[PDB]
Design an enzyme around this catalytic site. Structure first.
Site, PDB file in Angstrom:
ATOM      1  N   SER A  43       0.789  -1.220   0.000  1.00 21.08           N
ATOM      2  CA  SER A  43       0.000   0.000   0.000  1.00 21.08           C
ATOM      3  C   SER A  43       0.828   1.280   0.000  1.00 21.08           C
ATOM      4  O   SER A  43       0.242   2.357  -0.134  1.00 21.08           O
ATOM      5  CB  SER A  43      -0.944   0.025   1.201  1.00 21.08           C
ATOM      6  OG  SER A  43      -2.004  -0.890   1.009  1.00 21.08           O
ATOM      7  N   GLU A 139      -5.319  -3.618  -6.866  1.00 19.38           N
ATOM      8  CA  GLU A 139      -5.619  -4.258  -5.592  1.00 19.38           C
ATOM      9  C   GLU A 139      -6.602  -5.402  -5.814  1.00 19.38           C
ATOM     10  O   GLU A 139      -7.547  -5.261  -6.589  1.00 19.38           O
ATOM     11  CB  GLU A 139      -6.223  -3.264  -4.618  1.00 19.38           C
ATOM     12  CG  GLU A 139      -5.317  -2.123  -4.287  1.00 19.38           C
ATOM     13  CD  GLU A 139      -4.235  -2.516  -3.317  1.00 19.38           C
ATOM     14  OE1 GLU A 139      -4.168  -3.705  -2.939  1.00 19.38           O
ATOM     15  OE2 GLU A 139      -3.460  -1.624  -2.923  1.00 19.38           O
TER      16      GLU A 139
END
Length: 261
Positions: A43, A139
């Site tokens: 992230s 993602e």
């Protein structure tokens, strides 16, 4: 140096692989540990996607207020904010804040789509002089953190330099830069990572990252009270696919860095 011996010892005690890059903006000195090795970004890549949208907004002055629909099919594995707006809209500002401050994965995927795919995020990196950053997937698969896999990696040195340019330099316009800083300073996921190894009086803006192989990352801009700011990147990954996160390693690395400045 003492600091590199202590970081090496920390790494040895942890059983994993540690990457550190510190930039001291006072004298532009750098402290590097595995500074040129690739690590999975997880992230921490969300900073580049948000900054890419911010760059777009310099010309599209209203872009950040553009509403984006959140549909059930958009939801992936971790969507603390996007979940709250399913079947409604979020502005690109709100999605950027969600991606950065809560590490929302749906928000990140909307930012990637806004940029035309992972290649559009990577293109922004290249445009600001980061030839190392590469975003290859969306993602949640960008977090697989497979040893040796170059996808979705960067180096500590590269990320430190780029984070410096985005927050302290002028890769972004003045208003965009200030917004990015405000977002990073309001991160909610970083209390156990770099922040935990630093004096409580210091102001920190950071973006964490975690993934498989116990990958545990944090990138930060640090404003010590009465002292030039620092940029600190700490990447950590482990040899077991199912290893647990080790945010304590990042706190410890930051503490070792703070010892000396």
């Amino acid at each position: 140096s003492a600091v590199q011996q202590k970081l090496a010892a920390l790494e040895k005690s942890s059983g994993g692989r540690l990457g550190v890059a510190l930039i001291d903006t006072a004298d532009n000195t750098q402290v590097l540990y595995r500074g040129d090795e690739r690590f999975p970004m997880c992230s921490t890549s969300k900073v580049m996607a948000a900054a890419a949208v911010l760059k777009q907004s310099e010309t599209q002055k209203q872009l950040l207020n553009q509403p984006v629909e959140i549909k059930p099919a958009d939801l992936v594995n971790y969507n603390p904010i996007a979940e709250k707006h399913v079947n409604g809209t979020m502005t690109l500002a709100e999605l950027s804040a969600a991606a950065l401050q809560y590490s929302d994965n749906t928000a990140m995927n909307k930012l990637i789509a806004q940029l035309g795919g992972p290649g559009g995020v990577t293109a922004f990196a290249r445009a600001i002089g980061d030839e190392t950053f590469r975003l290859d997937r969306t993602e949640p698969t960008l977090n697989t953190a497979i040893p040796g896999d170059p996808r979705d990696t960067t180096t500590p040195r590269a990320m430190a330099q780029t984070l410096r340019q985005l927050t302290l330099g002028h890769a972004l316009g003045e208003t965009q830069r200030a917004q990015l800083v405000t977002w990073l300073k309001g991160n909610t996921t970083g209390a156990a990572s770099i922040r935990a190894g630093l004096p409580t009086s210091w102001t920190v803006g950071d973006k964490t990252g975690s993934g498989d192989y116990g990958t545990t990352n944090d990138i930060a801009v640090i404003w010590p009270q009465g002292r030039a700011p620092l940029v600190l990147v700490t990447y950590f990954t482990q040899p077991q696919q199912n290893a647990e996160s080790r945010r304590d390693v990042l706190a410890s690395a930051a503490r070792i860095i703070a010892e000396g400045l």
